[PDB]
Design a protein around this nucleic acid. Structure first.
Length: 110
RNA sequence: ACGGAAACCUUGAUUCUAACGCUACUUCUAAAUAA
């Protein structure tokens, strides 16, 4: 059945302080010894899509993986057909296109 | 037939140890002068 794209819009609301971290160049000057990853322009906390993708894959590896996942390349067909898999024919590119997460209630916080 | 595909800046770690809201202190003194 023909092409389709389905978008799962949501609003992540931190109930506890988030520490994705990863200060490299801009956030590296944070003077905190563990700065959260920020936007280079607006200096706003950001949840990168890699964090969501990795955490979701590692969490679903405990439910939808009948064999033990020694490596992410050896993941089950279901996980590798969504998150992708570099070492197979059909599952080279996954069906999940994650996006970064930007602050949306900055005005509310003010 | 995108210098592209797969990658959690993650793992553990008590803003914790010691420290008298304490010291002296009678709810008490004075009764004049007139009758």
């Amino acid at each position: 059945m023909t092409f389709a794209k389905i978008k799962f819009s949501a609003q992540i609301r931190l109930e506890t302080g988030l520490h994705i971290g990863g200060s490299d160049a801009f956030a590296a000057i944070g003077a905190i010894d563990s700065p959260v990853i920020k936007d280079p322009i607006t200096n706003l906390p950001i949840i990168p899509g890699s964090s969501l993708k990795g955490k979701m894959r590692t969490l679903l590896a405990k439910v939808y993986n009948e064999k033990v996942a020694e490596k992410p390349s050896d993941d089950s067909d279901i996980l590798s057909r969504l998150f992708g898999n570099s070492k197979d024919k059909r599952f080279k590119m996954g069906r999940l296109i994650f996006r970064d997460a930007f602050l949306s209630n900055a005005d509310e916080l003010d």
